[PDB]
Every structure is written in C-alpha cells, then in structure tokens.
Amino acid sequence: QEKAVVLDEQAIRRALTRIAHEIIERNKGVDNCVLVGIKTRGIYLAKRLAERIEQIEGKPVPVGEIDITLYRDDLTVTSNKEPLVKGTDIPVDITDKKVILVDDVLYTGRTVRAGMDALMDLGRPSQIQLAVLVDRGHRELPIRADYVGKNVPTSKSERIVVQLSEVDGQDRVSIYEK
C-alpha cells in the first residue's frame, strides 16, 4: 500500500456512538443543544450524530451547516490556509443555545475559527463545543476538541482522507505520505 487505514467502517460508527454518549453526559441531556457541521463531510457527520442522539435520548437535535473553503496565499504546500465562509444554513435560533460544531479532522484549527465567527454572525450561543472524528495534531491556533473519535499521530507531510458513503459510497479514513 501507499496508504494506511486509521478508521475503518466499524470504527467510524463506534467513534460516532461514543461522541453521542459523551455529548449527552457532558450537557446532562440535550435540551438546548444544536449540532452544526463544517463542510460537506462535517454536515454528514453531524446528521449521523443527531440520528444517534435521537436513538439514545428520544429527543431530536436540530442540525445546521457552515460551508467553508480553505485557500492558500501562495503557490506552495503550506497547511496555513485561509478560510472563506461561503454560506450558512442553521434551521433554528442559536442564541442562548449550546452549539456543537462538528469537524471531520482537526488539524490547524483554522476552519473551526471561521466556524465560530460564522456562528457569532448569526446569534449569541451560550456555549460553542467542538466534536471531531479525527484529531491529527499540529494546531496553529489555540483550539481544542471537546469530543474526539480518534487521536491520530501525524507529520505535516501526511494527508488524511475521509470517505463517507453519502459522498464516496464508502466509509473510511486513511493516511498517506506526500
């Protein structure tokens, strides 16, 4: 191989179920919670989390979306990417609510920073928490996940690839060199 599998299909499901239980334990229930996915894959994970939480607790948790594209300022291969928020769609008011941002992979933190800015443009949440499927390290901003599916040690020359059915017809997270 040129890649290694760091979360297989069963492990992604197990991670999400653990995250769902952790959100319930931390918030003592889900009363005023709202899940907001970052980018297409984060939006799909948020919907999966909302489905699990509904199975556990029998209350529906609303799910919204923040659409973001990351750009480099140059022609090089820097992880230092600058986010642009392209759109939002959250179906409920977030003021005085507990918003849980959902990110597929936490790396630099720069996408999560943009997500937080976008939320504050829309309302005044009492809290913003962060759930991530993979934390690969190498923060460039002082950002930490509240809920982590799997910690995956990485170097900056490695890339994480996330496949989910809804987007690839398969669920898998892999790591490659280069």
Shortest gap between Cβ of 47 and Na ion (angstroms)?
14
Q: Where are the beta strands (DSSP E) in the chain?
A: 3-7, 33-38, 63-71, 82-89, 98-106, 127-135, 147-151, 158-163, 172-177
Q: What is the per-residue burial (b if ≥16 Cβ within 10 Å, else e) of 88-102?
A: bebeeebeebbbbbb
Contacts to Na ion from residues 86-105, by CB under 5 A: 104
Q: Report if residue 110 touches Na ion, rule: CB under 5 A.
A: no
Smallest gap, in angstroms, from Cβ of residue 160 to Na ion?
Answer: 10
39 binds Na ion (CB under 5 A): yes
**Which of 63, 53, 65 is CA-nearest to residue 27?**
53
Taking the complex as a whole, the smallest distance from the CB of residue 68 to Na ion amounts, in Å, to: 9
Instruction: Report phi then psi at 94, rounded to 5.
Output: -105, 0
Range in contact with Na ion (rule: CB under 5 A) among 17-25, 33-41, 86-94, 170-178: 33-41
Q: With binding defined as CB under 5 A, does residue 41 bind Na ion?
A: yes
Strands 3-7 and 82-89: unpaired
Residue among 41 and 52 whose Cβ is closer to Na ion: 41
Q: Would you say 83 or 125 has its CB closer to Na ion? A: 83
From the CB of 105, what's the least distance to Na ion, in Å?
Answer: 7
- Other Cβ atoms less than 10 A from the Cβ of 130: the count is 22
CB of 40 to Na ion, least distance (A): 6
Chain gaps in the chain, named by the residue before each (C–N > 2.5 Å)? none
Q: Which is nearer to Na ion, 23 or 68 (CB)?
A: 68
Residues pairing with 85 in the sheet: 68
Per CB under 5 A, the segment of 1-9, 12-20, 38-46, 164-172 that binds Na ion is 38-46
The residue among 97 and 136 lying less far from Na ion, judged by its C-beta, is 136
Task: Please give the residue ranges that form the binding site for Na ion (CB under 5 A).
Answer: 39, 41, 104
